[PDB]
């Protein structure tokens, strides 16, 4: 079984904080990481590899420093890594990004299973995986809570707001991943093997991808402006009395006075 995992390097936006006092964005502890949902997409793939034998290829599209997330992928067991790196891909919206990735995948041969994260925590669109599926003409299931393989079929657990579901589809297919176990550890030996590996770097011309379907050129949308949102500070009234009955009487009296609890 051949698997491709689409992996994005992102700033760790979970470390960003807007200070409600100044309304400024604080970026203490923000570094580039492997997108968390992609970590789950990878771990899903590696679990399939361990169970069934599967060859796992990770692909990322980014600047040259994105190569580090590919090294991390190899360090935990992925077989092969490819870096798609060219200023011609820069400024891409989700359509242009998914075109680039679809055409990269098709170049090397569509695999049995493509795994993407549910979303990237920077853009937060959740659009690339489905758009890839459409570009390649493949069925999808998004936001997987569990993925299994039975023969030539993929079995995916997925919920919506009303229903808990399980779906099957035949390979080749695309799955986007909401949860797996946390990605496994990379040992020193793993990280050394990854460091020695050859990671090819592919330009648009090498992959024969037309310039006009990638990057800004291929993007129907454009970000015209960005800004930090207003956060209104909350001055909470917190009771910390040793006797819980006293804390509860104080809280409840205040909830009643402030019309939060009624009847």
């Amino acid at each position: 079984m051949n698997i491709v995992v689409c992996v994005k390097q992102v700033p760790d936006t979970a470390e960003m904080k807007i200070d409600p006092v100044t309304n400024n964005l604080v970026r203490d502890g923000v570094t580039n990481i492997m997108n968390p949902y992609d970590q789950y997409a990878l771990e899903t793939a590696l679990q399939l590899k361990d169970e069934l034998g599967a060859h796992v290829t990770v692909i990322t599209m980014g600047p040259p420093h994105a190569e580090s997330v590919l090294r991390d992928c190899l360090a935990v067991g992925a077989d092969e890594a490819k870096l798609v790196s060219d200023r011609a891909f820069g400024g891409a919206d989700t359509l242009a990004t998914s075109a680039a990735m679809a055409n990269t995948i098709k170049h090397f041969g569509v695999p049995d299973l493509i795994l993407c994260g549910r979303q990237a925590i920077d853009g937060d669109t959740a659009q690339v995986g489905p758009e890839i599926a459409e570009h390649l003409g493949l069925p999808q299931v998004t936001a997987a809570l569990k993925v299994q393989v039975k023969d030539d079929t993929v079995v995916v657990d997925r919920d919506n707001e009303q229903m808990s579901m399980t779906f099957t589809m035949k390979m080749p297919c695309v799955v986007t991943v909401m949860r797996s176990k946390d990605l496994r550890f990379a040992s020193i030996r793993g990280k050394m093997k990854a460091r020695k590996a050859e990671i090819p770097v592919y330009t648009a011309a090498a992959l024969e991808i037309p310039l006009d379907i990638i990057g800004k050129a291929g993007s129907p949308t454009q970000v015209m402006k960005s800004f930090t949102p207003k956060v209104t500070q909350v001055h909470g009234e917190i009771f910390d009395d040793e006797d819980p009955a006293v804390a509860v009487d104080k809280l409840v009296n205040k909830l009643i006075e402030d019309k939060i609890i009624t009847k």
């Binding site: 989700t94 669109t125 999808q140 009303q162 949860r179 402006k225």
Partner: protein
């Protein structure tokens, strides 16, 4: 590369009718409310798009809630949402009738459908948007949060059509139904039938007969790792019963076996906006906060005075939830009756 480029003759704003038990889910009405305003700004019509096994009396409900036009495509295959069936139907209608913009509620299934349609048509799609505006010519201005809510972006789809976006639920207000409204129902016949490649082998309702789901509860009584044991969630069920709310939990609570996934609040779960969110033994990770930070009031019950959840809580107690909960429930019950 000319696929999806504007003709110039596109017109009208379309709202996707997501439905459950035949009936529109509430975000459909939220979108009709906001998109009525946008349609009026550009002197175009507002349409609702209904892909269903049985239209029932839904079209008239959509018109009473703002729609000028309702496009109905009816087939038994549409009973339940599916990517393949619904993308085909919607794209056939876009091709036939040429809307200027399309708005999809950013529900779980809407976030699946939207990008499939956008890629098939080859147009622009803005995600999970929270502010919308329109020029007189019908160009939509899409404003959305990104970077975990730390950045806002304003985005245009200038030259491709339809201009698409998914739109965050529980952001915009529905109109009151108006039985004096009139509109036109257009029955659309599918040109090509498809075979759905994805088979549903299990489809179970997450909430039982006449019980309260967290998705719409006016009070959410939520537990995390600090609830200590599954059996202690009884304390939150008691609280929820006293108030007429529902019980939720964190992703840590799911992982420890305390609650099932459909009760998970946060970016990977449900986003709730109750009148009161009680956060009990929940630290306030950013990933949990993403699902509840727009609750009207947050009450935090935590042993750690430095828990991040206190930062956004108007009220709270520093103490042991397991001691606090039963006393709070009893006091509330006594205030209520009588």
């Amino acid at each position: 590369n000319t696929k999806g480029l504007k003709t110039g003759n596109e017109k009208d704003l379309w709202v996707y009718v997501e439905h459950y038990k035949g009936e529109p889910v509430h975000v459909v009405y939220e979108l009709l409310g906001e998109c009525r305003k946008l349609a009026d700004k550009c002197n175009q019509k507002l349409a609702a798009v209904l892909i269903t096994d049985d239209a029932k009396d839904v079209p008239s409900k959509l018109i009473a809630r703002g729609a000028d036009l309702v496009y109905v495509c009816q087939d038994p295959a549409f009973k339940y949402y599916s990517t393949d069936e619904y993308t085909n139907a919607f794209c056939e209608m876009i091709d036939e009738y040429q809307p200027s913009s399309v708005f999809i509620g950013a529900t779980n299934d809407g976030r699946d459908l939207g990008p499939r349609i956008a890629a098939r048509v080859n147009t622009g799609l803005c995600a999970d948007c929270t502010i919308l505006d329109a020029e007189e010519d019908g160009l939509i201005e899409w404003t959305r949060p990104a970077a975990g809510g730390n950045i806002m972006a304003t985005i245009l789809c200038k030259e491709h059509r339809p201009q698409m976006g998914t739109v965050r639920p529980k952001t915009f207000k529905a109109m009151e139904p108006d039985a004096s409204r009139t509109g036109e129902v257009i029955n659309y016949t599918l040109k090509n039938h498809v075979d759905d490649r994805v088979t549903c082998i299990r489809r179970e309702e997450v909430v039982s007969e006449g019980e309260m789901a967290i998705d719409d509860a006016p009070f959410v009584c939520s537990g995390g790792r600090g609830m200590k044991a599954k059996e202690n969630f009884s304390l939150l069920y008691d609280l929820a019963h006293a108030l007429g709310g529902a019980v939720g939990g964190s992703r840590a609570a799911v992982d420890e076996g305390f609650i099932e996934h459909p009760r998970q609040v946060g970016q990977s779960g449900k986003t709730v906006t109750p009148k009161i969110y009680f956060a009990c033994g929940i630290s306030g990770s950013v990933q949990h906060k993403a699902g509840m930070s727009k609750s009207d009031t947050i009450v935090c019950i935590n042993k750690d005075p430095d828990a991040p959840m206190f930062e956004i809580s108007k009220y709270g107690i520093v103490g042991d939830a397991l001691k606090i909960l039963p006393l709070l429930t009893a006091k509330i019950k006594a205030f209520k009756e009588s």
